[PDB]
């Protein structure tokens, strides 16, 4: 409820509103003005991205509290990263990540 916090909230709201309005108004002006007269490897890559992004979010949560988690948290994240790297090595070696076989 600080005045700095509410001022920054208002500034963020005005930033988003004015930015989206600027883009929309620029397209509106562009439209109104002026006269008139597949392979499955894409799925594989996107699916690998989704899986590795969820494992990335796990590491995202770990990274902000490494000191509070101590060495036992380091050991757990090391097991997590080793399993993730084993899966990555598996995908590379079986040709799943090889774009040109």
């Amino acid at each position: 409820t600080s005045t700095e916090v509410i001022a920054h909230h208002w500034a963020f709201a005005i930033f988003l509103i004015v930015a989206i309005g600027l883009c929309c108004l620029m397209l509106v002006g562009g439209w109104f003005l002026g006269g008139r007269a597949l392979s499955a490897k894409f799925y594989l890559v996107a699916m690998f991205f989704v899986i590795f992004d969820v494992e990335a979010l796990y590491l995202f949560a770990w990274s902000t509290s490494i000191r509070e988690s101590g060495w036992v948290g380091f050991v757990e994240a090391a097991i997590f990263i080793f399993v993730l790297l084993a899966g990555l090595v598996y995908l590379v070696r079986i040709g799943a990540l090889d774009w040109t076989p």
Binding site: A40, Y43, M47, V50, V54
Partner: protein, 100 residues
């Protein structure tokens, strides 16, 4: 100053709408979409419950929920691609050879 009942009711509304979409839609892709709506509503309910009690367990439940949602979405879309490649048809009623 938001009641827990309102967040839970919103999650129930989203769960019901996702289940309706899962039942009434004959396309397999829209069934998968309704499944995502259902599991996202469940994760929203867990977040509302955790934020009422002031505990981090609701967001951890959300994290496990979206890990399941990601993995089951990938599996379902792989099965959808296999069905389209085998039959050139996304009809969930046509894949019904096994019956009592």
């Amino acid at each position: 100053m938001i009641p827990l009942q309102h967040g839970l009711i919103l999650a129930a509304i989203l769960f019901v709408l996702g289940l309706t979409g899962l039942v009434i839609r004959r396309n397999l892709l829209f069934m998968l979409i309704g499944l995502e709506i259902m599991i996202n509503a469940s994760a929203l309910a867990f977040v509302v419950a955790g934020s009422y009690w002031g505990q981090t367990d609701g967001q951890v439940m959300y994290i496990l929920a979206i890990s399941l949602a990601a993995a089951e979405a990938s599996i379902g879309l792989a099965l959808l691609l296999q069905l389209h490649r085998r039959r050139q048809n996304l009809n969930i009623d046509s894949v019904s050879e096994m019956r009592g």
